[PDB]
Amino acid sequence: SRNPIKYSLPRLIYEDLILPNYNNDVDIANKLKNVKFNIFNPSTNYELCLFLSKLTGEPSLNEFFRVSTTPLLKRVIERTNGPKNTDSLSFKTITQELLEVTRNAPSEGVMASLLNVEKHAYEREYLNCIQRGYHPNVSAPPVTIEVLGSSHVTNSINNELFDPLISQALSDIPAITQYNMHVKKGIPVEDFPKTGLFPEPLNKNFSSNISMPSMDRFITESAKLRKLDELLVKLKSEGHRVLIYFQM
Amino acid sequence: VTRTAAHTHIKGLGLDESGVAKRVEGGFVGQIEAREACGVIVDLIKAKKMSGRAILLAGGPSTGKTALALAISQELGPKVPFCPLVGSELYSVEVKKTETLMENFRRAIGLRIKETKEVYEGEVTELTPEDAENPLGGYGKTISHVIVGLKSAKGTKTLRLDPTIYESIQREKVSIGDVIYIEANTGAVKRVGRSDAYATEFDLETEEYVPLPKGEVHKKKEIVQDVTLHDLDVANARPQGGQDVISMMGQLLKPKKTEITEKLRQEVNKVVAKYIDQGVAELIPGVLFIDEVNMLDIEIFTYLNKALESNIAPVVVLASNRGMTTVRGTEDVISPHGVPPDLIDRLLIVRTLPYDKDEIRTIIERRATVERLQVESSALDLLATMGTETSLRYALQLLAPCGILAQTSNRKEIVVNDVNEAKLLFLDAKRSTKILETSANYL
Amino acid sequence: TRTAAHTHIKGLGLDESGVAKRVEGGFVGQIEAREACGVIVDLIKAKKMSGRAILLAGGPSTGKTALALAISQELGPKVPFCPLVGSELYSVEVKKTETLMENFRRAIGLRIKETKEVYEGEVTELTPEDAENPLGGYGKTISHVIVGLKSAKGTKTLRLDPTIYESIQREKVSIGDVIYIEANTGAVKRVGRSDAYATEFDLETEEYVPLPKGEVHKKKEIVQDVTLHDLDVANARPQGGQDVISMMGQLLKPKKTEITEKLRQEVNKVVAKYIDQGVAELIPGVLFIDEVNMLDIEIFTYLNKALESNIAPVVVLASNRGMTTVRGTEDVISPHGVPPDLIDRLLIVRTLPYDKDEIRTIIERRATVERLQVESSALDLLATMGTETSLRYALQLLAPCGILAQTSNRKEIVVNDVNEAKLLFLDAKRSTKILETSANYL
Amino acid sequence: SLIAAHSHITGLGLDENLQPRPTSEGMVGQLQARRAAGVILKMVQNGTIAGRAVLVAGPPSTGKTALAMGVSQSLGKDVPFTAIAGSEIFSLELSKTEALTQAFRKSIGIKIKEETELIEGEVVEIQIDRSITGGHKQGKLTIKTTDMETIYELGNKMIDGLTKEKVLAGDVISIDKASGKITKLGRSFARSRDYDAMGADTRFVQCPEGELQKRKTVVHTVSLHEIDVINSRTQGFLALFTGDTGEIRSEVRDQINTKVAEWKEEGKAEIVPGVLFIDEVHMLDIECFSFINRALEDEFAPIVMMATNRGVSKTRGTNYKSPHGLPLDLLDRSIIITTKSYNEQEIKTILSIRAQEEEVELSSDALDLLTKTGVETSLRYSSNLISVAQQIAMKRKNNTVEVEDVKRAYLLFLDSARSVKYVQENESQYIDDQGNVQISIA
Numbered sequence A: 001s002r003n004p005i006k007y008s009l010p011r012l013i014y015e016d017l018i019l020p021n022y023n024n025d026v027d028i029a030n031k032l033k034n035v036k037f038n039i040f041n042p043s044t045n046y047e048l049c050l051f052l053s054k055l056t057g058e059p060s061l062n063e064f065f066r067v068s069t070t071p072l073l074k075r076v077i078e079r080t081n082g083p084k085n086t087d088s089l090s091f092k093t094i095t096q097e098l099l100e101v102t103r104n105a106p107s108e109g110v111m112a113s114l115l116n117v118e119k120h121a122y123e124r125e126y127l128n129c130i131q132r133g134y135h136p137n138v139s140a141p142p143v144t145i146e147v148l149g150s151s152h153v154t155n156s157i158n159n160e161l162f163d164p165l166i167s168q169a170l171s172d173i174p175a176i177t178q179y180n181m182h183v184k185k186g187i188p189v190e191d192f193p194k195t196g197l198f199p200e201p202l203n204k205n206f207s208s209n210i211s212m213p214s215m216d217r218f219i220t221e222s223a224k225l226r227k228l229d230e231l232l233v234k235l236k237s238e239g240h241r242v243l244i245y246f247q248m
Numbered sequence B: 001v002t003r004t005a006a007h008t009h010i011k012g013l014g015l016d017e018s019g020v021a022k023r024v025e026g027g028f029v030g031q032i033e034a035r036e037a038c039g040v041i042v043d044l045i046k047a048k049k050m051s052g053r054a055i056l057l058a059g060g061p062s063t064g065k066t067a068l069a070l071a072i073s074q075e076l077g078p079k080v081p082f083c084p085l086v087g088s089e090l091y092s093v094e095v096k097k098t099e100t101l102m103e104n105f106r107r108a109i110g111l112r113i114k115e116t117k118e119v120y121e122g123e124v125t126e127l128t129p130e131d132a133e134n135p136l137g138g139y140g141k142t143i144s145h146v147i148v149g150l151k152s153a154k155g156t157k158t159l160r161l162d163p164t165i166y167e168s169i170q171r172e173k174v175s176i177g178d179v180i181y182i183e184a185n186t187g188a189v190k191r192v193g194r195s196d197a198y199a200t201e202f203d204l205e206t207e208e209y210v211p212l213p214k215g216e217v218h219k220k221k222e223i224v225q226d227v228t229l230h231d232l233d234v235a236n237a238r239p240q241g242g243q244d245v246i247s248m249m250g251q252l253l254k255p256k257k258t259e260i261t262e263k264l265r266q267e268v269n270k271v272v273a274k275y276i277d278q279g280v281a282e283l284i285p286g287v288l289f290i291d292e293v294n295m296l297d298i299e300i301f302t303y304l305n306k307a308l309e310s311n312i313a314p315v316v317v318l319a320s321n322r323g324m325t326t327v328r329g330t331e332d333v334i335s336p337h338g339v340p341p342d343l344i345d346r347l348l349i350v351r352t353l354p355y356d357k358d359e360i361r362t363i364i365e366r367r368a369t370v371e372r373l374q375v376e377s378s379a380l381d382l383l384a385t386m387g388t389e390t391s392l393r394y395a396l397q398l399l400a401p402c403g404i405l406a407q408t409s410n411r412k413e414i415v416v417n418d419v420n421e422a423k424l425l426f427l428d429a430k431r432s433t434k435i436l437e438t439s440a441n442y443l
Numbered sequence C: 001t002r003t004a005a006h007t008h009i010k011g012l013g014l015d016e017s018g019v020a021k022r023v024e025g026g027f028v029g030q031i032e033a034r035e036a037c038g039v040i041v042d043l044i045k046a047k048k049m050s051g052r053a054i055l056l057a058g059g060p061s062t063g064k065t066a067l068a069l070a071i072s073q074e075l076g077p078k079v080p081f082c083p084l085v086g087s088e089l090y091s092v093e094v095k096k097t098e099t100l101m102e103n104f105r106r107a108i109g110l111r112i113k114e115t116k117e118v119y120e121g122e123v124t125e126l127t128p129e130d131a132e133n134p135l136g137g138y139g140k141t142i143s144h145v146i147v148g149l150k151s152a153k154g155t156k157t158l159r160l161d162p163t164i165y166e167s168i169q170r171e172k173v174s175i176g177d178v179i180y181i182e183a184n185t186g187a188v189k190r191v192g193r194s195d196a197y198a199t200e201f202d203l204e205t206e207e208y209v210p211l212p213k214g215e216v217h218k219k220k221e222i223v224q225d226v227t228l229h230d231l232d233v234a235n236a237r238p239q240g241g242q243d244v245i246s247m248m249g250q251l252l253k254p255k256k257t258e259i260t261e262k263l264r265q266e267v268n269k270v271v272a273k274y275i276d277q278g279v280a281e282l283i284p285g286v287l288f289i290d291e292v293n294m295l296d297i298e299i300f301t302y303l304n305k306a307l308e309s310n311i312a313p314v315v316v317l318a319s320n321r322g323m324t325t326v327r328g329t330e331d332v333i334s335p336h337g338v339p340p341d342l343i344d345r346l347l348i349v350r351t352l353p354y355d356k357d358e359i360r361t362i363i364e365r366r367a368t369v370e371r372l373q374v375e376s377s378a379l380d381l382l383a384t385m386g387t388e389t390s391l392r393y394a395l396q397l398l399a400p401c402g403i404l405a406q407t408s409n410r411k412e413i414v415v416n417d418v419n420e421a422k423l424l425f426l427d428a429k430r431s432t433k434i435l436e437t438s439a440n441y442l
Numbered sequence D: 001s002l003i004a005a006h007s008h009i010t011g012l013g014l015d016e017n018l019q020p021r022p023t024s025e026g027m028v029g030q031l032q033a034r035r036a037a038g039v040i041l042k043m044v045q046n047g048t049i050a051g052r053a054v055l056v057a058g059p060p061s062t063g064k065t066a067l068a069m070g071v072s073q074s075l076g077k078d079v080p081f082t083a084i085a086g087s088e089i090f091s092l093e094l095s096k097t098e099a100l101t102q103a104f105r106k107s108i109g110i111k112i113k114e115e116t117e118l119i120e121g122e123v124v125e126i127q128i129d130r131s132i133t134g135g136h137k138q139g140k141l142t143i144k145t146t147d148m149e150t151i152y153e154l155g156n157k158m159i160d161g162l163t164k165e166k167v168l169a170g171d172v173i174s175i176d177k178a179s180g181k182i183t184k185l186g187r188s189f190a191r192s193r194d195y196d197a198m199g200a201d202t203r204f205v206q207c208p209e210g211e212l213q214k215r216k217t218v219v220h221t222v223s224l225h226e227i228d229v230i231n232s233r234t235q236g237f238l239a240l241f242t243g244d245t246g247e248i249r250s251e252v253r254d255q256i257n258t259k260v261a262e263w264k265e266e267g268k269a270e271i272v273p274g275v276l277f278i279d280e281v282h283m284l285d286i287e288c289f290s291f292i293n294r295a296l297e298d299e300f301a302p303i304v305m306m307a308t309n310r311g312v313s314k315t316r317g318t319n320y321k322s323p324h325g326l327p328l329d330l331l332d333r334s335i336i337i338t339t340k341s342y343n344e345q346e347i348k349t350i351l352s353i354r355a356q357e358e359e360v361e362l363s364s365d366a367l368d369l370l371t372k373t374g375v376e377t378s379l380r381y382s383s384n385l386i387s388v389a390q391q392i393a394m395k396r397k398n399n400t401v402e403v404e405d406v407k408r409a410y411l412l413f414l415d416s417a418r419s420v421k422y423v424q425e426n427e428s429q430y431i432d433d434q435g436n437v438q439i440s441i442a
Ligand SMILES: Nc1ncnc2c1ncn2[C@@H]1O[C@H](COP(=O)(O)OP(=O)(O)O)[C@@H](O)[C@H]1O
Pocket: B006, B007, B027, B028, B029, B030, B031, B060, B061, B062, B063, B064, B065, B066, B067, B068, B363, B392, D297
């Protein structure tokens, strides 16, 4: 699938403004602004890193420089709940203490029922058996970019638009594939790629925007069939035998 | 039986074949010149040749300005798009009022498209993914391909996929024995349901069971779609439905209107023109009705002066009930109808006269016979006196308390004593103002 | 110790079922105002009323804020008290009506009692054993798990569900660690390692919590106090989930959002259901807004609406204005800057100004609280200064006298010290007089 | 629960022929206003028409929101009733028209019928198959009753619900098919060998007999705003409670209207109208009135009743004064109910029913003094004096409010006019409109 809108771009802008080469200093300025003059560099700002590690209680003093140099989604995906030492300025809130207890608490508990009113509202009003009402009219992919004669453009566009870490984050590995990687290749569970971060939809109806022809809309639009289905329920409940004659 | 709310006794303009307005037709009483002008612009819109043509409905309150807009909306039918609007709609807290006006301008230009679709559907028989050589190599995918065996009526196909379509396929949580629907246009798939070739009564997942799809697995079907240009602009501004990173990520951000650029509108217009020139698409211009146009300030009028000169402009209908009122956003500019003269020069003002007592009485008759109420002739004359004495809308909204006070006395007809009791219970604007003047502590 | 314009007042100081005695609790004078505050405190202690508003008024430097703080001290540290300025409602993230409703819900407290059965202690032996009939095609078909526990004068091994071993693997539990076990859920968690395993390695990140006291198995009835707004913000935001939206919103700025009435209705009905079960006890508190005259009239209208609710706590307002136009409108004259529709919904308390002897006693009490020594002549001169210029100006000019006394190596404040402090530091009237008589843009 | 202002009103106090009784259902007096409220209650209950604007006009402390609460109580359950103030429309995340459209669509209800299946039985064998990461889940459920044994197949949400509220293969459970609710009724097998890790004290219920699977038809009520937010985006069910529903597009609203009409034409769903009550509607811009003038002309519009205590005053957003604070085009399409002031007897019945509401016993002469001070001052002041007089009453250790207690409460707490008079001869101590004040007493 490709978007019909084509945003053409000259090659010269891409070679002389984005890609580093001998006649520009994109890479040198990137190193100067991200590495040498970074205020989280422990080689030049060890005091600030020690101050921040005393504050947050992080075990690694290189973590702030790692955080400030990586994008947001990559920070979200491999966020690991490492242990923090108790001799630190980081605290526990009242709300975090309510939230941490009620992770695996069952029903008929005070904290669990007081902390799960939205799921009680979900199962009270029968939200897993409601049909989808609205679907969008037009659906489109993002705008394609063509550069006439540059495979690096196509490689970068294919890398961004189809990022394997992001795509593996947004879905699951098949179970037989997980079995083949785990015990037939020796890869442990901790070094598996992160998977299943896509949110669950509300229903099975809300999982996609393609709506099948409704059988209920098929039967209810003809009133003769509506009366036939009205009488056929009590005819079947009577334990009967029925013949129907047609012409067409 | 039904529900009525100040309308739905109007079905159309009620004109003849030559455009002359009948006196009592389509639920209308009087307004012969206004209905003839509305018929003239009905033929102008149905000509589908003009852009940036605007009328202005001028008159007092309760004269039939909005009723004429619902009449032209019903006369054009549901095929031609009709966008009702109010002057307070354009003030958005997420985008400027110029962009809201342009979006409502583009939301009144419909489009009929005969679109072909490539469809792979059938019951899933096998599901075997082949793994990669180095799944932890950083780059690349976990799997190489996925073999899907699809079987429909009189056909059976074996499908070898990429990882990318399989991500959307396993996003729907399909399994063995479930019939799917692979739309090959966008890569989106739909879990149709379980098949009834296997068992039915052993499920807890409130499932639905559909038989095998008729025809072969690979299909090319024609679907007639009716979209607007604003939907195309929205779908290209916030892209969803592809099988890429941004197409996933766009469905989970919070929706928010953005200032759509003019370059995107040019590209959308270019691909729409190349759709029409291929014989595929058809352009259906419509009506943008803006009730209470005097609520707009001067900047929206200033942008309207340009937007009525654009080449894909719809037919705009404005309604106002001001005589000589200063335009909002200004202090000294005194203009008719609250509409500044630089746009009034571009308009075509249609005057709407008030009503007489007999017109009031037969309007009460039509609203009584629509609301399923039977009234006496003496109460009918009394309500005509109400309409000619206080207000037409006060006589319109006093039919239902009269009917309820008749029903609470075990009766179907409405008598003059019922109207007197409804006088004693409910007040009007004049009597409330009169009791407001001679008041102790700001009644 | 630190003192900041307060903390010499410990409650109101009323005797039993009667009047407020003269010099008790750090309060002097304002007998009827203390009586009104005491009977309001008893009304809140009755815990029967809702949506009862009281406004106390008077001139500046009279003790409205002191009376509100005495009310908060008389209620105790368990019943909630939410101090607020009227300027804080104008928030630019969320509408001010939602901010006012948030501070309405913040003054309603809950007393939740619960009994928790717990297991804790060091891990001495942990092994999951295979079943007697191992299933084919799988490795380590576990039938049950044996885990040994060890605490202070306590050692017990126990059987376990086999699914708990998966959480054991998720938690990285080995021999020598201390494990918190709750009964009805499983759900293992690790605190650290015992102190006997502290010095096994030279370099180690792992903390060494001491071995817990008491038996391995204990049942403690805990009591948790929470406000209704904490329940609202806990239920509104998503719980522990595996979606990318939840951990994305954890990392982003916690923007305030318009809490709907539906969530409040669900929280109130489940709290009412738990009250009818005898578990939770509802405690209403005090929302205190001083300088109420600076509220805009839309906030006053919502106060008119929301004072009629079933769960509105007691609202205490303070203002110092007289006939002054309400902010947000131009053509009304209203007492204390409060519109008359809201004025009809509250009870108005007067706070009378003080005299020479009350200023003397206030100055003496604030000198003794500050651990400062003052002469009687200096006390009389400070009383005359407070009468002549301002009581609060005599309050501010106590510590400079002490600093100038300790600069002269004296532990006593003398009239020369307060004369030097009067010369060095000016009041409002003398500053206005020097502003009127200068043409140098003073 | 707690005791509020409108706690004592439960209904409208009407006969079959809509004739109000002088003292019934907590309402006293106001015969024509209550008869008009019965008419508007019957016209809401009929559901024949839609979109009628109602004024409730009168002075303050008369019973306008009391009449609205009586209408809400006589409306009963299952009918939506959105009661908002005027200031909630102005928001920083929503336009005024969007907030009014949400307030309109919250008051129109959709009653949807559904066919569910209740499965109750003693479970026998639970086989749960999960992958290595724990994401993919499938399995089989074997349940039985006295007469029927039947195995099943488990979905993902079924296994997630079974993992919560731990089933131990012998506990009688009940599953709702369409609601997805898992309820463990108790334990019937009484297992002997048990791992002593849980604090399980499950009740001895019996194994159910008869049919395993039972069909049931249920009905649940949802309103149009909920379906709009649910169909708006991917995680709209969180936006139900967070209120992060920012300007839902018109395409969603018209498609939802079309789908709701399609549900009505098939007999699956029915449409119930409700009441949108806008308290203090004069606190609204002319934009809001101009939007209401057209939004009342739609099919999916509720019956709107709005209250106004204001006289001929300035409409907001304009420069002219209008009757009841509303422009004449909105006053044209509305019907006015005029509420009158009270005599001594109606105030006496109001104070008696309020004292009966707070379970406070009042003396006859004490009630006479309360009626006299509710006649000369406002009614709400004498109503609010009751609770503090009761507090002074058991502060004297007697459970009967005497004349001295209410006299002490009248002395301790002041009226509007008494506060105005007390300020007006002491204008120097209070901050005036110009900010000038005299803090020094000499
Ligand atoms: N010619 C007519 N026939 C029947 N009803 C009419 C006619 N003209 C006006 N009305 C009624 O008068 C009311 C006011 O009309 P509308 O155009 O909606 O507002 P306004 O006239 O104030 O702009 C409507 O409810 C409509 O039903």
